[PDB]
Design a binder for this molecule. Structure first.
Ligand SMILES: C[C@H]1CC[C@H](c2ccc3scnc3c2)N(C(=O)C(=O)Nc2cnc(N)c3cn[nH]c23)C1
Ligand SMILES: C[C@H]1CC[C@H](c2ccc3scnc3c2)N(C(=O)C(=O)Nc2cnc(N)c3cn[nH]c23)C1
Ligand SMILES: C[C@H]1CC[C@H](c2ccc3scnc3c2)N(C(=O)C(=O)Nc2cnc(N)c3cn[nH]c23)C1
Ligand SMILES: CSC[C@H]1O[C@@H](n2cnc3c(N)ncnc32)[C@H](O)[C@@H]1O
Ligand SMILES: CSC[C@H]1O[C@@H](n2cnc3c(N)ncnc32)[C@H](O)[C@@H]1O
Ligand SMILES: CSC[C@H]1O[C@@H](n2cnc3c(N)ncnc32)[C@H](O)[C@@H]1O
Ligand SMILES: [Cl-]
Ligand SMILES: [Cl-]
Ligand SMILES: [Cl-]
Lengths: 303, 625, 625, 322
């Protein structure tokens, strides 16, 4: 049923766990979506609340409210699935092939009715999730769009980072909506983005060399940086805490939990493959669930 | 009939996908051999020990299918020229792994991207893979006609796109290729897959790829416009580019998803077939000439060698040339014999080099078209063709034609000639030693006698063709100079090349050469203005000839005789390609040298940089007297 | 379907004759290009100036017809080796003339007779013609199997035919050929047209032509017997010879007039087709093997190189070999585990060099055929084949098979093996370094463990094949020793060759090699009794192997495993052919040498004459460790 | 890969400055490792890895009795012809103090671990004699705090102009091989009639002992040489520096050349085609140190102002045997 390479793990505000997996080897290169109301039973397929098979692999996932699941597909498609009235099925609401290559990242904007997707076709697309159409198509980058991240509370602002060594702050209210920020010297390629949950104008980004950096948009200066990992930083997820922790994920197969000054507070080597996604529990704010390509779901308790 | 393929970065099941793309009409499929997102570790534990399988099985397709229908694609995360040493070494290992799996599958081609300026380590890994077991598989370097940086939307407020003209910068991607193929030492297994964007660059950026080994052209679905019925079409400039690529017999690769979702996908491909079935049709004889495109042949030497029967057959299968010869003879007969002497004056015509006698029949048709009397001598030193001449004479011609089996420089003529007629001309006019032959035959021409041709002139033009340069380079033979192939001309239907300057006259010969001291040696200096950035690989050679007055033959492209095809152009290569910047002048020197036994050409470039003097003392190429 | 031609010395009209011989069913026509009685003078007047035409025109046939259907014949009056100097020079000129007219026509072959011992000047003229313009046309030397002098009727009262046995004299015509081709330096464009008389010679005279480049066999109509219905047939010995020639895929030439005048002429040809449709049929797989006849390939090195997918596919397309392996594993499992322990004892089987896993499936079939439990390790260093192995393991095998991607000489086994199973054998048994690999794998074999194969032995046999010698000679490459091609073995389906002595064992290896100091180097001296006059060109190499007890594989011809074809024989050539007279002994020396990095073979002949030591220090051929 | 001849070792030994530097390095290391109070109790284990005819052995002895410290010497050498000289020396002069080992240092099972390993396995390009691999194979019998002399070495490259040397390389064409193979191999040569086009820059650096989890001696280096003259590039001169111990160094790099030392000539990496370089342009060179199980080789290419072919790909023209 479920494929080996776990790609995404997201906690719904009621504690349920959304898993997104792909088969990146073998005969069939497909993917699957799963909902576990018992998060400890994951990734066992037989004891899942819901599960469905997608036509292609899942490169990224995110919730759309409490019933929606937004999928970036290898097929170049952005898909919206939704749960049953009893949340026993996962049905395809739409599947739009507007990208010309693998859709690598998706992020739902603050309103919850619009989204932004990035892809290896170098393009970034703003979608209306109700009309199921592309509101905007921007070709601002010059290489594969590595990450897009909607601002937590501004429906017109988001972030993008690509292999063209550009970190772009986007405000769709401007004639030229993109603004290049970040290090004025050619730093290593940005690979992961995360807005700060409380400080509006602040975000962190992890690069291909293992460095996590804390940046202010107004000052556009690398306020701080730390060599957290030995390999590319693939994910950055803040905790729901009032003063939030920062979860950093890397292809060194390790999970790190840092503080406000990017100092190492917790470290886990439990995974034996790439650490793909991390999500903090909305019920136990010291419990952090990570998934990786070793088909392992790890629930860490964080001091 | 276009040969086309489908580019996909998402293959759930290889058999289903292959069947679908075949039903859509594609001849092959460009696909990844490992999952594009399946980034693999080769150094650092624990991910280094990721349990297999690392990709899908080779048993999923027959060996025939792997050999004919599948084009492997390099995984997009493999960056052998990354600034990070870890990523660099890991991408080296992964690129070797994927190339070796492609060779293990027997794939006919493998796609690798050139998406940045520096691909030195990529070239190193690919060159090491090429020299690991002799294979014939191709490597298609995916090179964009316009770099994405120069193609992005002007939507970055604090990083505007330059609106200023950058002539050489707009050609940057070509340099990306040119360096790469230079690092890989012009490997014949490395070709270009030119990717075409929605916005075409200036014409010089496109012409920068003339003469390059373009094996594929990649057409994204996003560049297609939409018509009334909703079918995908292309802009008129894109149609120009498609016609140019079709003249190169390239394979077209369709990439991207279906954005014309109302119609079937094959629509895209169908449009190309449409464009292929409505292209400007070629000449009727240009099909036998199509098979000769960029085919290198040693120049024929009808003086030193006896031509074969089918060579003469090819010479004769050209009605335009012999129509011109007949018209020239007709005009000359009307000019030499007035009407009142038409029954008293018998003109002596001598075909010098009669072959199987097409010029003899041309002379007869001209004589009874001009209503004049002629006496014909058909002189030919090739006794095998003399057999044909004498069978013709016994069966048809009769005593009107006297067949002479002798060299025209030795034959003691029983009488002097009113008109001598010959076609002793090669692709470079005098490269078959027509001057020497007609000089040896001049003494039995009357004091007012006419030679047809009366004049001929060779023409030279610098060309760019890395394809033809590599073809010449591949002509290395054992037991001779490793670079002798560069010091000899080749008769070749030049096809994939770029003419860098207008052809200019080289050597001119007139007949009869009534001059005290006849010297057929020549020294010529030519200055070719070049208004493009390019790479000189050699010089195309053509010729014009005045047979009589305004009756002429020409393979010079600007004045080419319409419908005449018995002469392909000639090619004088050079050992080393010479970079020529826009505005520079290519200065070439050409010698026609000789001794008692042989004639040869020597040539050298002297600007913008000097080349070696090619074929000194005829060490690599001579024309026997 | 026989390819056949008609030999005629009388062609009134070429088109009528060609149409007639085509209607009779012949594929081509051997005919004169000049009239056979049209003796021509080249020196002495007045006949030197005989008016043309000297022969008929080339316009009588299309160039296609000349290229495909016409075989030129030398005029019978041309005697380049005449004792008269006038006739000698005139025949030189005439032979050059006729050969040049044949080349002018583009004829695919030209017939020249060898009807006497001395053809030195004929060879000189032909060799000069061959080195005048590169052509691919063939020259068929018409050589009689029995000279006419030894074939005449004993009807000369004062000159009786010798009734005394002349072993070497009866082979004289072969010498006629052997000298000629030696004078012409083994030109690939010179082949044999063997003419067969009414009385066949002894079997050794016929076998003298084994391994010779026989392109045609000439059958006079006079040698055909007559049956009841009046149809022409052949004697049973002639049928033997026809079958032997059909195995060589020769073209049959019918010469002479119709002496069975009641029937049509095609009758003759039809008989041959009859003989061809009732020949002993070959093996079903011998069609893919027919295309490999005498095709030289470099020996595969599965250790140094990673084999391609289709190479493994060829390895697996052999059910007899894997049936033998399965039977060996079955017997070993029954011998190692008694019935009472069949459910308690799990045998550890390790496939060392699993490829895509045919030995793994063989082990599984043997285990559940022997009703015994096994635990399988599939060890393979080729990661491309490891992909196939691991897809097999995930999809079908399961945890019963553990796939190891490692060199068996490095792999730290988690447990010791009851049985190790491999097919690391080449055409010469150990030429793929199976001894070294199985030595490196010996430490994780149990103290009483079994190796399958348990033993293997190579075999050598001197052979005569001027065809294969010339094929090796043609393998000269630039940038290396001009004779390196002779100092390396070739895997080849030996076809047109003559085995000169019975194969004898060369090198033998046993596994496990429980010995204090293991030394896989070898020195072997072999004495081959030869009972025929012949020419040594190399040594065929085969192998036998004991997999387990009486379960064996063999490509040794005397003990060849029926229906097994995954191994062609090997060929070790020598630089210079060595004449071997009947009764002499061919003494060969063979070394198996090695250092830390490579293993190679050296070989030398020491009797009846010494050769150079071939491949010294592995300068031309090594096998990588 | 080869066993050096007797006169080659004789040339190696005819250099008193080099062995004076080696002796001073060993002397400083012995004084640093053994305090004065332990000078009679502590016997240091010194191992000459690649002893040749034993000049480093005599240097170690002179350093030991110059530092007033006790040493136990192992003279390791795989060349048995030089082992003859070593063992005649040992029987006639050295005695039981020196133990001669006739073995490859990558195979030899040492009876004890070494305080100091001493070698001169360096070529004109530092590591072109595979000193990294040899000293890696010998690292396991070095003590956890053991010292390697040399402790470090670094190669240096400099673009040069020499049509004379270019023509000399071109004349080295041999039959039965690639007509341009002579351009894809380095040459040891006392560079004389040449023009150095830019200051030498470091290429490859190796440290010993290489206490690192995954040792990888392969290298990829990109060098940018500013050229302030009109000239024609024909190749790259190669030199080396080495830190034997602390401030005791050897160098054939011209700017820091060890005065009076001459046992190393510079090396020359040619290129197939000369490259015109105008004043103000930058010569960009790429150098690789590649290897497999059997051989190590160098690949190099110019990428600016114009690209050259990648020279010696896959070691087709030049390899260094392991
Ligand atoms: C049409 C193509 C095929 C025939 C011929 C060619 C070239 C090289 C080789 S090498 C083996 N065969 C060939 C054949 N081609 C020529 O261009 C050519 O040589 N033309 C002529 C040369 N000289 C003349 N006196 C005449 C008169 N009419 N045409 C002439 C190319
Ligand atoms: C059948 C013919 C075609 C495949 C193969 C061959 C030879 C040379 C070249 S060169 C490029 N391709 C090839 C292919 N032939 C062999 O005789 C052969 O090598 N057999 C084997 C060698 N080694 C083994 N371990 C096994 C196991 N089973 N059979 C094996 C001839
Ligand atoms: C001085 C000149 C003559 C000897 C030698 C040389 C070079 C090439 C060939 S080819 C045939 N003979 C030779 C001889 N030259 C070297 O520069 C040299 O190789 N030095 C050294 C290399 N490696 C070492 N481990 C040491 C230690 N001390 N000096 C070393 C040039
Ligand atoms: C029609 S191609 C030129 C012809 O002229 C013939 N030819 C060339 N040179 C001479 C010569 N010197 N004398 C006579 N025929 C010649 C050639 O054999 C060929 O048939
Ligand atoms: C079935 S042909 C022989 C097979 O054994 C494999 N092989 C050869 N030598 C070794 C070795 N030393 N270790 C592992 N596999 C090997 C080859 O890669 C091939 O698949
Ligand atoms: C003094 S020049 C370098 C010396 O070290 C020796 N040498 C090089 N490599 C090794 C090795 N791996 N083991 C032992 N001696 C070596 C050489 O034979 C030479 O005498
Ligand atoms: Cl389901
Ligand atoms: Cl050619
Ligand atoms: Cl071969």
């Amino acid at each position: 049923c479920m494929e080996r390479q776990l790609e995404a793990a997201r906690y719904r505000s009621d504690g349920a766990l959304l898993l997104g997996a792909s088969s990146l080897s073998g005969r069939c290169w497909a993917g699957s979506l799963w909902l576990f109301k018992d998060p400890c039973a994951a990734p066992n397929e037989g004891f899942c609340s819901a599960g469905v098979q997608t036509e292609a692999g899942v490169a990224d996932l995110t919730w759309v409210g409490e019933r929606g699941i937004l999928v970036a597909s290898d097929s170049g498609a952005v898909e919206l699935w939704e749960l049953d009235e009893n949340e026993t099925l996962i049905v395809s609401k739409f599947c739009k092939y507007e990208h010309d290559d693998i859709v690598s990242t998706v992020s739902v904007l603050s309103s919850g009715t619009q989204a932004v997707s990035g892809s290896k076709d170098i393009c970034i697309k703003v979608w209306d999730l109700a009309q199921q159409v592309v509101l905007s198509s921007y070709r601002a980058h010059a290489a594969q769009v590595t990450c897009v991240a909607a601002s937590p509370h501004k429906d017109s602002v988001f972030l993008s980072c690509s292999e063209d060594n550009r970190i772009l702050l986007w405000d769709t209210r401007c004639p030229k909506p993109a603004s290049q920020i970040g290090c004025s010297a050619p730093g290593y390629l940005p690979t992961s983005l995360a807005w700060h949950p409380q400080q509006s104008e602040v975000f962190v980004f992890g690069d291909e060399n293992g460095t996590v950096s804390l940046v202010d948009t107004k000052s556009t200066s690398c306020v701080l940086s730390s060599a957290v990992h030995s390999q590319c930083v693939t994910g950055l997820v803040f905790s729901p805490h009032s003063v939030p922790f920062l979860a950093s994920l890397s292809e060194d197969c390790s999970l790190a939990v840092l503080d406000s000054s990017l100092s190492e507070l917790f470290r886990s080597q439990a995974h034996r493959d790439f650490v793909r996604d991390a999500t903090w529990s909305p019920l136990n704010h010291s419990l952090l669930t990570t998934v990786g390509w070793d088909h392992q779901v790890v629930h860490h308790v964080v001091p | 009939r276009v040969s086309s393929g489908r580019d996909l970065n998402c293959v759930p099941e290889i058999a289903d996908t292959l069947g679908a793309v075949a039903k859509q009409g594609f001849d092959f499929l460009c696909m990844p051999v490992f999952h594009p997102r399946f980034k693999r570790e080769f150094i650092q534990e624990p991910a280094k020990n990721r349990p297999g399988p690392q990709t899908r099985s080779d048993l999923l397709l027959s060996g025939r299918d792997w050999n004919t229908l599948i084009v492997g694609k390099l995984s997009p995360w493999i960056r052998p020229d990354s600034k990070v040493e870890k990523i660099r070494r890991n991408s080296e290992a992964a690129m070797l792994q994927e190339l070796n799996f492609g060779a293990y599958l027997g794939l006919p081609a493998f796609l690798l991207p050139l998406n940045q300026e520096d691909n030195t380590n990529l070239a190193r890994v690919l060159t090491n893979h090429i020299h690991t077991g002799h294979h014939s598989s191709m490597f298609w370097m995916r090179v964009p006609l316009v770099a994405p940086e120069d193609l992005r939307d002007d939507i970055i407020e604090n990083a505007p796109t330059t609106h200023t003209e950058e002539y050489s910068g707009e050609e940057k991607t070509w340099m990306w290729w040119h360096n790469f193929r230079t690092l890989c030492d012009y490997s014949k297994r490395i070709a270009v897959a030119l990717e075409i964007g929605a916005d075409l660059p200036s014409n010089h950026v496109i012409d920068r790829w003339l003469g390059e080994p373009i094996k594929a052209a990649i057409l994204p679905t996003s560049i297609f416009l939409t018509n009334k019925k909703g079918f995908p079409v292309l802009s008129k400039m894109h149609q120009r580019l498609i016609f140019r690529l079709l003249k190169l017999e390239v394979q077209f690769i369709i990439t991207g998803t279906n954005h014309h979702s109302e119609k079937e996908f094959c629509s895209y491909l169908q449009y190309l077939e449409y464009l292929s079935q409505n292209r400007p049709p070629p000449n009727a004889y240009e099909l036998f000439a199509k098979g000769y495109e960029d085919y290198l042949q040693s120049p024929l030497q009808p003086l030193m060698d006896n031509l074969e029967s089918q060579t003469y057959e090819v010479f004769e299968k050209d009605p335009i040339k012999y129509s011109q010869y007949q018209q020239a003879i007709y005009k000359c007969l009307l000019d030499r014999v007035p009407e009142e002497e038409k029954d008293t004056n018998v003109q002596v015509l001598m075909v010098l080099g009669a072959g199987r006698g097409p010029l003899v029949n041309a002379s007869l048709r001209a004589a009874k078209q001009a209503d004049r009397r002629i006496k014909l001598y058909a002189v030919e030193k090739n006794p095998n063709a003399v057999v044909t001449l004498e069978n013709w004479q016994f069966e048809e011609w009769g005593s009107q034609v006297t067949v002479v089996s002798s060299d025209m420089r030795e034959w003691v003529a029983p009488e002097k000639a009113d008109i001598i007629v010959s076609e002793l001309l090669g692709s470079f006019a005098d490269n078959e030693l027509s001057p020497e032959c007609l000089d040896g035959a001049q003494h039995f021409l009357k004091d007012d006698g006419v030679s047809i041709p009366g004049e001929y002139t060779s023409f030279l033009a610098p060309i760019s063709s890395s394809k033809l340069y590599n073809e010449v380079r591949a002509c290395r033979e054992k037991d001779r100079d490793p670079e002798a192939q560069f010091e000899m001309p080749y008769v070749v239907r030049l096809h994939n090349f770029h003419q860098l300057s207008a052809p200019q006259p080289c050597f001119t010969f007139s007949h009869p050469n009534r001059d005290p001291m006849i010297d057929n040696n020549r020294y010529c200096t030519l200055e070719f203005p070049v208004e493009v950035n390019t790479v000189l690989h050699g010089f195309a050679g053509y010729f014009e000839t005045v047979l009589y007055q305004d009756i002429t033959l020409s393979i010079r492209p600007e004045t080419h005789s319409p419908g005449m095809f018995s002469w392909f152009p000639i090619l004088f290569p050079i050992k080393q390609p010479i970079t020529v910047r826009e505005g520079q002048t290519i200065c070439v020197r050409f010698w026609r040298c000789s001794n008692s036994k042989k004639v040869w050409y020597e040539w050298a470039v002297t600007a913008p940089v000097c080349s070696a003097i090619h074929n000194p003392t005829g060490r690599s190429y001579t024309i026997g007297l």
